A paper describes a structure:
As the sole target of neutralizing antibodies, the virion surface protein Env encodes a glycan shield to restrict the antibody access to antigenically conserved sites. Small protein mimics of the CONEs are designed by epitope transplantation and used as immunogens to focus the antibody response. Here we focus our protein design efforts on four CONEs, including the structural elements of β sheet 12/13/22 (CONE 1), α2 helix (CONE 2), loop C (CONE 4), and loop E (CONE 5).
The CONE 4 (loop C) residues were grafted onto the C-terminal loop region of an α/β mixed protein. A characteristic array of three glutamic acids flanked by hydrophobic residues defines the conformation of CONE 4 loop in Env. Our design largely recapitulates the conformations of two charged side chains (E88 and E89). The hydrophobic residue L86 also adopts a similar conformation to L265 of Env. Comparison with the Env trimer protein revealed a high degree of mimicry: within the epitope region, the Cα RMSDs between the designed proteins and Env were 0.42 Å (C2S5) and 0.34 Å (C4S3), respectively, suggesting that our CONE mimetics accurately display the Env residues. The electron density maps revealed that the side chains of the grafted residues were well positioned relative to the computational model. As a control experiment, we also immunized five rabbits with a synthetic peptide of the CONE 4 sequence (LAEEEI). None of these rabbits could induce antisera of significant titers, in contrast to the C4S3-immunized rabbits, indicating that for a linear epitope, constraining it in the right conformation with suitable protein scaffolds is favorable for the generation of functional antibodies. The CONE 4 (loop C) and CONE 5 (loop E) immunogens did induce HIV-specific antibodies as assessed by ELISA and western blot assay. The purified IgG fractions of anti-CONE 4 and anti-CONE 5 rabbit sera bound to the deglycosylated form of gp120 but not the glycosylated protein. Most of the animals immunized with C4S3 also generated antibodies that bound to the deglycosylated SOSIP Env protein, whereas no such antibodies were detected in animals immunized with C5S3.
Author numbering: 4 to 99
The structure:
């Protein structure tokens, strides 16, 4: 479609200390997405994605299967997937 969606994500495995945040931001920006990425307090990576639905879906697949080159992804959990009519962000940020 040419609709917009928002979705929350959390990635499990060898996902911290592998340049995951930098690569996620770069891929998000390449895909024209806004949102954020952050290392959690439980050894995972999380955030939200917003943008054109096909681009969000491409990013979801990237988060399931690839991530940063030295990452090892066991699972990507997605939640709160929804259609949106406006963006809630103006950039794709790494949240410290």
């Amino acid at each position: 479609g040419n609709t917009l969606i928002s979705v929350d994500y959390e990635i499990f495995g060898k996902v911290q200390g592998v340049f995951f945040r930098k690569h996620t931001q770069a891929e998000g920006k390449k895909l024209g997405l806004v949102g954020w990425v952050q290392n959690t307090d439980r050894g995972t990576v999380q955030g939200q994605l917003q943008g054109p639905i096909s681009k969000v879906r491409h990013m979801q697949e990237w988060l399931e299967t690839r991530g940063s080159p030295k990452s090892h992804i066991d699972k990507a959990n997605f939640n709160n997937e929804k259609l949106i009519e406006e963006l809630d962000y103006s950039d794709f940020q790494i949240v410290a």
